[PDB]
């Protein structure tokens, strides 16, 4: 998208539920800024940092760190699931 008051091209996407935006100043050139924004968006899509465009490989790869964080949480709240406390 284009923000005219700021004179920037913005890329807005969603990554892990969060809504994220990045700016690309157009003073360096309208075509250059727009193409930089498009290239950044396509790089995010390819690397799997946009949720709706992810592939099975990206989901599998992200599930590993998801599992690590979930195990940390489980150890955090271990004493409740066992029946003590």
Which residues of this protein are in contact with RNA, per CB under 7 A?
A: 1-6, 10, 12-14, 19, 21, 51-52
Q: At closest approach, how far in Å is the CB of 78 from RNA? A: 33
**Which residue carries 């700021």 as its tokens?**
6
Task: Identify the DSSP state of 51.
Answer: G
Q: At closest approach, how far in Å is the CB of 62 from RNA? A: 16
Tokens of 75: 């150890």
Beta strand ranges found along the chain (DSSP E): 2-3, 8-15, 18-25
Our CB check for RNA shows the closer of 5 and 76 to be 5
Our CB check for RNA shows the closer of 31 and 52 to be 52
- Rounded to 5 degrees, φ, ψ at 38 are -65, -40
Q: At closest approach, how far in Å is the CB of 82 from RNA? A: 36
Q: CA 33 to CA 68: how far, in whole Å?
A: 38
Our CB check for RNA shows the closer of 52 and 82 to be 52
């Amino acid at each position: 998208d284009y923000y005219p008051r700021l004179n920037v091209f913005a890329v807005q996407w969603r990554e892990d539920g969060q809504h994220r935006i990045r700016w690309f100043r157009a003073a360096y050139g309208l075509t250059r800024a727009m193409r930089a924004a498009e290239n950044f968006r396509k790089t995010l899509e390819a690397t799997g940092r946009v949720d709706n465009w992810r592939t099975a490989r990206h989901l599998r790869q992200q599930m590993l760190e998801r599992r690590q964080q979930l195990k940390l949480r489980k150890k955090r709240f271990a004493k409740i699931s066992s029946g003590q406390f």
